[PDB]
Symmetry: C3
Subunit: 135 residues, 3 copies
Amino acid sequence: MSSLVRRIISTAKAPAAIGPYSQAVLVDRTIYISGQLGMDPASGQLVPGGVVEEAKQALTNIGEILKAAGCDFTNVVKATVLLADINDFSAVNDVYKQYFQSSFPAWAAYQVAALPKGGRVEIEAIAVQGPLTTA
Amino acid sequence: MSSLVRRIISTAKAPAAIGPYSQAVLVDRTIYISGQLGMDPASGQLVPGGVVEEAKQALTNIGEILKAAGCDFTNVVKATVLLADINDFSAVNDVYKQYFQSSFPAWAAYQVAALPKGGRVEIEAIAVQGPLTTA
Amino acid sequence: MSSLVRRIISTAKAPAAIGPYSQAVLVDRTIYISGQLGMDPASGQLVPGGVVEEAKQALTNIGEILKAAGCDFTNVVKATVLLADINDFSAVNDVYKQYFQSSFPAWAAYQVAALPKGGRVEIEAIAVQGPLTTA
């Protein structure tokens, strides 16, 4: 069979790994992006201000990883939004909507028991490397 | 590179979006289906009767989304079953089994802290558009 | 369109199914592996010793499923690590690192409310059937 391209995506514009994972893996045309917390890329510390600020930073981090792979938010096809508190659903929704301005991904959003570093939100994503033709 | 097909799947036979997501995204041949709660498509209210009734409605909803994409349950390759209570595992298993009557998908099933709308179960799925040849 | 290969992966070297799922599904070149607990393949009982021993057994189980599909850990592109306790993150990380000795997968790791069988850890994975060419 054909040898499919598998590339580790890595950018200093997103946080360093806090463990045994890659920021994202591109395989064939699919990009699996690791769960992102609202961590500042330079410090690796959660940004202050709680879930809204954290959600913004997490999505900014995903954006930088997408850019490293020659993609943007239009390439995302599935997202998972993990919350520390289900009462934050509406607030996070309003943040998320600002990044996906068409062809909204499939998703799931729900509350887990706890995230690393005491994070209030973690977002995972799957993207597909372009070009994509959307009818 | 080739421009891959990316299509938003949308049917009025499944619940309207309660937020910034598509019911499903078809990209190349893979269909990412959003997490479905046991919501009535017409009202958008959770069906009464608790987890068993909700599980049935959620799977019915996935079925309608699959149909919109020219697929059925035989096309599902991976499911995720999110529970509000791990004690409901056996009950949900018995519901789920009635929809997948061969070539059972890969899966994960476990308890989360909370689902949207106070749901007792949420099911996500990945399918692949046919034809599929199963040896 | 072409008829894509869909194959159920099954090995007696990994635990029997405790419900309506396949150990893994290969579709085209992507392998979706079901969530694995730290269950002994012969008995179907969780191994003693808590999360570290369970994590080792779960990863051993994934390894046997990969082998059945003609793959190994180098083929894994995304993992999900579900914990019963976020305080176990560092311990599980140290176990996991021993299995992935290059080209680390994308991942997400976090605490859920409860796993089947009172498990302390469950690991899901996505792999891509080789050959893969890593630059």
